[PDB]
């Protein structure tokens, strides 16, 4: 019956997705890698990539079919995807010690990890005749109305999905499969709003959510915020970095800070949202001339992840970020991109709501905001390897 359902669902596909699926059956790894890191380029390459049409039609085919109930999936995942740089056990070893289990449990206590690519999954437990490439097994509960495309292989049937969410691990236990120890993790999907390339859709959402926000502001504070974001945001942030109220207190800027904070506090974000901000080395306590800014050698990336991944963050100033993820000529030289998930109910406002050029879809957050970094990944950008940071805003 599963084969018949797969045949039925694949019959109604049109041709373009037909050769897309056929090409996926032989070049899975490269297509998956491209789909993982595709939205961090300029507007030119994304339209100019040789695989953009492939990805578009594959995504459409996947999104054609959706499930009406939550259901479970099973797949093997590398522990490196969950910010674990060590090895649980070798591929020839049979057992995992208590120390490695404890370390892996400690690494994933309270964190959320984002998955952003294609993946082959199974609707049944991995019994005999399957492959066990990693010592980590995932029991993932997919939410309602998510894409799921069953396609018949040469002999068996396999299913492909598109990851667009962030998952958290509840419990991990050690199990035995055919005389080898594995780690089984029960994970749940946490929903969030992400506009990877639909910058138009994100802008429309910002309009629909914050166009009337300005009408809720008292005119004096409204004009205050407008003029400040227009001209003096640089000065305010520069004053805030130096801990101005601590060193040289002055009310001419404390009033500005309070007004901006109250304006942001007036209307909070209603739904979980992801924002992309191109950060600089000066933010991370580095300089452009610093040797660690060269992310081409593996040693620099490894040291940066060792000393920064999994730690916290704190910005005394305000944070300006864009809903879209595509690179711009304004921040072309910045090698670090900050990926931030905004929990529902947190303070923040859409600056671009007001008419005119209010910014690059800018979003403001309250001062003294703190973040937790979960994982760090690197993607190629022309002739240099740039770096991506996943962070979660915390109250």
């Amino acid at each position: 019956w599963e084969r018949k359902e797969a045949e039925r669902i694949e019959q109604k596909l049109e041709r373009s997705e037909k050769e897309a699926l056929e090409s996926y059956k032989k070049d899975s790894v490269e297509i998956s890698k491209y789909s993982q890191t595709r939205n961090y380029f300029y507007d030119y390459q994304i339209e100019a990539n040789s695989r953009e049409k492939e990805y578009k039609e594959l995504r459409n085919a996947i999104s054609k079919n959706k499930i009406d109930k939550p259901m479970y999936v099973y797949y093997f995942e590398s522990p490196e995807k969950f910010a674990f740089n060590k090895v649980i056990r070798t591929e020839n070893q049979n057992e995992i010690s208590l120390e490695k289990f404890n370390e892996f449990k400690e690494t994933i206590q309270n964190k959320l990890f984002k998955q952003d690519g294609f993946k082959d999954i199974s609707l049944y437990e991995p019994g005999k005749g399957d492959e066990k490439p990693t010592p980590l097994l995932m029991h993932l509960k997919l939410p309602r109305n998510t894409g799921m495309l069953p396609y018949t292989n040469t002999n068996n049937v396999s299913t492909l999905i598109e990851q667009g969410y962030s998952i958290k691990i509840d419990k991990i236990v050690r199990i035995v499969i055919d005389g080898k120890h594995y780690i089984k993790a029960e994970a749940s999907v946490v929903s969030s709003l992400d506009f990877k390339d639909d910058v138009s859709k994100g802008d429309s959402w910002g309009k629909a959510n914050y166009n009337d926000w300005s009408n809720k502001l008292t005119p004096n504070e409204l004009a205050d915020v407008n003029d400040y974001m227009r001209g003096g945001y640089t000065a305010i942030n520069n004053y805030l970095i130096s801990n101005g109220p601590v060193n040289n207190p002055n009310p001419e800027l404390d009033s500005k800070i309070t007004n901006i904070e109250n304006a942001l506090k007036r209307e909070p974000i209603p739904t979980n949202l992801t924002v992309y901000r191109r950060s600089g080395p000066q933010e991370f306590g580095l300089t452009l001339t610093s040797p660690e800014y060269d992310f081409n050698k593996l040693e620099n990336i490894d040291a940066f992840k060792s000393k920064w991944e999994g730690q916290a963050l704190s910005y005394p100033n305000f944070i300006s970020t864009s809903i879209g993820s595509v690179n711009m000529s304004a921040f072309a030289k910045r090698k670090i991109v900050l990926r931030i998930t905004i929990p529902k109910g947190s303070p923040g406002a859409y600056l671009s709501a007001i008419p005119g050029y209010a910014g690059e879809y800018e979003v403001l957050l309250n001062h003294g905001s703190k973040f937790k970094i979960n994982k760090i990944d690197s993607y190629k950008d022309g002739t240099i390897t740039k770096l991506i940071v996943d962070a979660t805003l915390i109250p």
Partner: protein, 37 residues
């Protein structure tokens, strides 16, 4: 090892729970207590 997070046979019940005693409530195995009877 020394924790109740072992599922050797992979059947959603911890090893020590099967060894000593358990019951099901809210579709989750819990440790047996005499007051449950």
């Amino acid at each position: 090892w020394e924790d109740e997070d072992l599922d050797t046979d992979n059947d959603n019940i911890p090893d020590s729970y099967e060894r000593n005693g358990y019951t099901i409530k809210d579709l989750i195995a819990v440790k047996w207590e005499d007051s449950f009877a």
